[PDB]
Amino acid sequence: PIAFPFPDPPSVCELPPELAEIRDGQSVVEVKFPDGISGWMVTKHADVRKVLVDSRFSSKVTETGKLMNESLVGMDAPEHTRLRKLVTKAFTARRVETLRPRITELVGQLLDELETLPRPVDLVKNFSVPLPVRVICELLGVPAGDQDTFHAWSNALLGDWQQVVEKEAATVSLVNYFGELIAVKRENPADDLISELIAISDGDSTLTEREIIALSIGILSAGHETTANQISMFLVTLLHNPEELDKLRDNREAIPKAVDELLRFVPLTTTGGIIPRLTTAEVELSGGQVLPAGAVVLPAVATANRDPEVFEDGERLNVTRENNPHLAFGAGIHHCLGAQLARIELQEALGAILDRMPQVRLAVPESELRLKSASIIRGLESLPITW
Ligand code: HEM
Ligand SMILES: [K+]
Ligand SMILES: [K+]
């Protein structure tokens, strides 16, 4: 077995070279984690998708611990089926699409603030970290008067492992905050997700208040650090590929395809941020490998998203790519609930940056940039820019 996680490459713009070497040779390999558990990794686009779509792979694994047990992402059917069907009574494509104008305003506000800071200015702290929380607040219905405090909580959640106590205490505050917000929204409902969910809960469905709380925090948690890290990594990738970036410069029509190309090419982790699945029966894969029952299986999204069988010239960035069946939002029943909302946030963020800061560049050499050591997601410590 080879050791997983692989070494981090010198450059934030490279993936571990062992991924492509596996994908393109042995394909499915055994790995060994640092705690000595042994697993399997699959790398081809067909195997990764199978691992996410097939019924034989299970996701089932303090306030923090309870919430993890209550989150969609750790559930299997039938519990997962029920909860998702309850949440999507309110979390709809219509709700998300109709938020686009407010997302655009929130992006503009943050850029209005950014452009008055001393320069060069860190994009991470001053834009990428706060934007996904603003958007989540707007979706959920957290009022602006609660937002400074809500940011402080959210940001405490992103700590290290070195701060288990900070994070647990932030989680506790968020849990009591959302209980109070439910009573305010029951009395004065508004156009937001919590108001609708409460109305569903108060009607005849079995949706509970606690489930509303667990949904709210699960959305925060799924959608803050992911989106945050991707905004900054996307900008770096684009800058590293100036002929791709030029195709976008006065051409906001091209932004949606570019975002999907960036999602494909700039991964959250080796597995797209997806926790290894557990097989519940043996499973035959596209190449004839049969994964055994009871096995921990890593779906290598990052490399499947460059599989030369599905993506032409897949190890390079092409922001014009039309044919892009990427797995960055997963597939099957756990397919990212926020997939459309995330696309909208990244589209609006990137289109505005390029519109407003068309000469944006890095204020340090790209070799000086580095991924945070102590993060579960691939993300920059800082991103010093000027324009
Ligand atoms: C670039 C931003 C994002 C990426 C790349 C991302 C990716 C993913 C992936 C790969 C999964 C599947 C996990 C699995 O199969 O185990 C997932 C699940 C989830 N996503 Fe996202 N996501 C992002 C943003 C968001 C946002 C903004 C929200 C806000 C709603 C969100 C809400 C969730 C939820 C609730 C789940 C669990 C769905 C379920 O288990 O049924 N995500 N996401
Ligand atoms: K790795
Ligand atoms: K959830």
> What is the separation of C-alpha 160 from the centre of its chain, rounded to a whole number of angstroms?
18
Q: Is 311 helix (H, G, I), strand (E, B) or coil?
A: coil
Residues with CB under 6 A from ligand 1: 52, 59, 72-73, 84, 218-219, 222-223, 226-227, 230, 268, 272-275, 328-330, 334, 336-338, 341-342
Minimal-distance CA residue to ligand 1 atom 34: 337
Q: Helices 63-70 and 209-223: crossing angle, nearest 10°?
A: 90
CA 241/CA 111 separation, integer angstroms: 23
Q: In sequence order, what E strands does the chain have?
A: 2-3, 28-32, 38-42, 57-58, 121-122, 277-279, 283-284, 290-291, 296-299, 361-362, 384-386
Q: In sequence order, what E strands does 254-302 have?
A: 277-279, 283-284, 290-291, 296-299
- Work out the angle at residue 366's Cα, subtended by the Cα atoms of residues 224 and 321, and round it to the nearest 5 degrees: 65
Cβ < 5 A residues, ion ligand 3: 71-72, 218
* Eight-class DSSP state of 128: I
Cα 300 to averaged position of ligand 2 atoms, centre (Å): 9
Minimal-distance CA residue to ligand 1 atom 9: 329
- Work out the angle at residue 87's Cα, subtended by the Cα atoms of residues 183 and 65, and round it to the nearest 5 degrees: 75
What are the structural domains, with CATH classification, of the chain?
Answer: 1-387 (1.10.630.10)
Q: Do 59 and 84 contact (CB within 8 A), yes or no?
A: no
**Burial class of residue 85, CB neighbours in 10 A (0-12, 13-18, 19+):** exposed
What dihedral do alpha carbons 170, 171, 175, 180 form, nearest 10°?
10
Range list of H helices, 252-338: 255-265, 301-304
CA 286/CA 47 separation, integer angstroms: 6
Residue of 336, 345, 347, 378 to test ligand 1 pocket, by largest number of atoms within 8 Å of CB: 336
Ligand 1 atom nearest to 136, measured from its CA: 29
Q: Is 295 helix (H, G, I), strand (E, B) or coil?
A: coil
80 is in an annotated binding site: yes
